[PDB]
Amino acid sequence: DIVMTQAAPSVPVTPGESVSISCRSSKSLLHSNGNTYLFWFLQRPGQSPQVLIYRMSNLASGVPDRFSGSGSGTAFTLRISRVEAEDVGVYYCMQHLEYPYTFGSGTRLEIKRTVAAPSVFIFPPSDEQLKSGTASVVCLLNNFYPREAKVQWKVDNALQSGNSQESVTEQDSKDSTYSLSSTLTLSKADYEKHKVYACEVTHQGLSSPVTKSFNRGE
Amino acid sequence: QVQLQQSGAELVRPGTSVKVSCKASGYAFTNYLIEWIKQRPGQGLEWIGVINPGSGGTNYNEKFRVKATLTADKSSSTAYMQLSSLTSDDSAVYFCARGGGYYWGQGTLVTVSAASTKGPSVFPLAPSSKSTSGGTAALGCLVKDYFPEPVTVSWNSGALTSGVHTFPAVLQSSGLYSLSSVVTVPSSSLGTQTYICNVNHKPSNTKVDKKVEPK
Numbered sequence: 001d002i003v004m005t006q007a008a009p010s011v012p013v014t015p016g017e018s019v020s021i022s023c024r025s026s027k028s029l030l031h032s033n034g035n036t037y038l039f040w041f042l043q044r045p046g047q048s049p050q051v052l053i054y055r056m057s058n059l060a061s062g063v064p065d066r067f068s069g070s071g072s073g074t075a076f077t078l079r080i081s082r083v084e085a086e087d088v089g090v091y092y093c094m095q096h097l098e099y100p101y102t103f104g105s106g107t108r109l110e111i112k113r114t115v116a117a118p119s120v121f122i123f124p125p126s127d128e129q130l131k132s133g134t135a136s137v138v139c140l141l142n143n144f145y146p147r148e149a150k151v152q153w154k155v156d157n158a159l160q161s162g163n164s165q166e167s168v169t170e171q172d173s174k175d176s177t178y179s180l181s182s183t184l185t186l187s188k189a190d191y192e193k194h195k196v197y198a199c200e201v202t203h204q205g206l207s208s209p210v211t212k213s214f215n216r217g218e
Numbered sequence: 219q220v221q222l223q224q225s226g227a228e229l230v231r232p233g234t235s236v237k238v239s240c241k242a243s244g245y246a247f248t249n250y251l252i253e254w255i256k257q258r259p260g261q262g263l264e265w266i267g268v269i270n271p272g273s274g275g276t277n278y279n280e281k282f283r284v285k286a287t288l289t290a291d292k293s294s295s296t297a298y299m300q301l302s303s304l305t306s307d308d309s310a311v312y313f314c315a316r317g318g319g320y321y322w323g324q325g326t327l328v329t330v331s332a333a334s335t336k337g338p339s340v341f342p343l344a345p346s347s348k349s350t351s352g353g354t355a356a357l358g359c360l361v362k363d364y365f366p367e368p369v370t371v372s373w374n375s376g377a378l379t380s381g382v383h384t385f386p387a388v389l390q391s392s393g394l395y396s397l398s399s400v401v402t403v404p405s406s407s408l409g410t411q412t413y414i415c416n417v418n419h420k421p422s423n424t425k426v427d428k429k430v431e432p433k
């Protein structure tokens with residue numbers, strides 16, 4: 001088969017600047033008809049892919065002029081000039097010369113924005129959940145940048161291990177931030193054996209860790 | 219306006235087969251090729267094969283030649299992909315696309331599992347002083363213990379979208395999924411605006427509209 005290689009798993013860019021995304025093939029994609037059968041696609045979070053460039057260097061209908069493609073028969077570049085915050089997503093090359101058609105592994109576009117520390121919120125378990133015998137404590141880290149953020153849980157000032165789970169959103173297409181939830185799961189019985197619940201947050205935008213806590217019983 | 223409309227999500231047992239469909243509208247179905255693409259959750263794209271609906275001719279990625287069968291029904295303008303001998307390796311979103319990849323279906327999620335469907339509980343993440351800063355309050359809903367994916371969440375029947383973050387689900391150690399959806403709003407609105415999270419888990423026919431009350 002023809003192997004498609006995208007050497008960078010992500011590339012960062014400030015809005016208004018230009019960025020290049022690279023792809024290579026293990027065989028020339030040039031056909032005797034003169035066209036090079038390299039296609040570029042964008043996939044935004046939660047959407048189907050969409051074509052940007054067809055046959056290496058041609059702008060697909062309705063795609064903004066800021067997208068352009070160039071290359072040899074084996075090395076290709078998608079250039080995005082005047083990048084917009086809404087350009088976040090994964091960019092894939094694909095060869096359409098020979099069966100089986102094959103895709104590159106994808107290159108995420110990371111939008112650079114001003115560093116922003118998370119706003120941190122903490123939620124005790126609801127009374128409804130406690131009636132069912134389980135307790136979920138939720139710590140929300142909202143609208144921060146960059147993506148890297150560490151959350152540690154302390155119950156009665158004992159650092160927790162093994163009982164939390166985190167989820168992170170994709171980079172927002174408008175404000176270029178991320179949000180993160182950390183959920184600490186205990187039984188109702190174990191939850192009532194303790195008074196102080198705290199999440200401690202480390203992030204580049206913070207000079208020292210931020211702690212949000214509550215005491216069981218308001 | 220061209221559309222490729224794929225069939226709905228499938229939960230299917232290992233060792234069985236499943237057929238997904240791709241119905242074309244807005245153009246002459248038999249004049250264009252249909253291609254099929256696999257995308258594992260959080261991963262890249264893999265090409266399965268292509269069919270010419272006018273001739274019935276097909277070509278398959280050799281990796282899928284034993285797994286996949288592509289057919290087309292001219293009378294209904296529908297292309298079909300059958301996946302046989304299912305294993306968890308086949309759990310993925312499957313796309314159809316018209317030849318060249320300008321027009322794509324919305325995808326069909328296929329989950330291959332022997333586990334039973336379970337509907338979630340929905341619990342409020344109530345706004346309090348511990349979730350209120352500088353005139354902004356955070357609130358949300360915890361959608362706990364469901365299988366399989368997916369769950370959808372809206373707020374106020376879709377009227378509230380600004381400031382909403384619905385998190386990717388996590389697979390808990392129990393083998394059930396959980397997710398949360400949060401929203402930041404003006405703290406001055408907590409006494410005057412009703413906030414409801416609309417949760418839908420289609421596999422269990424669970425539909426919950428949970429009002430999230432300040433505490």
Ligand SMILES: N[C@@H](Cc1c[nH]c[nH+]1)C(=O)O
Pocket residue numbers: 096097098099100
């Ligand atoms: N030349 C290709 C066949 C093809 C024609 N058009 C597109 N693909 C192959 O050998 O796989």
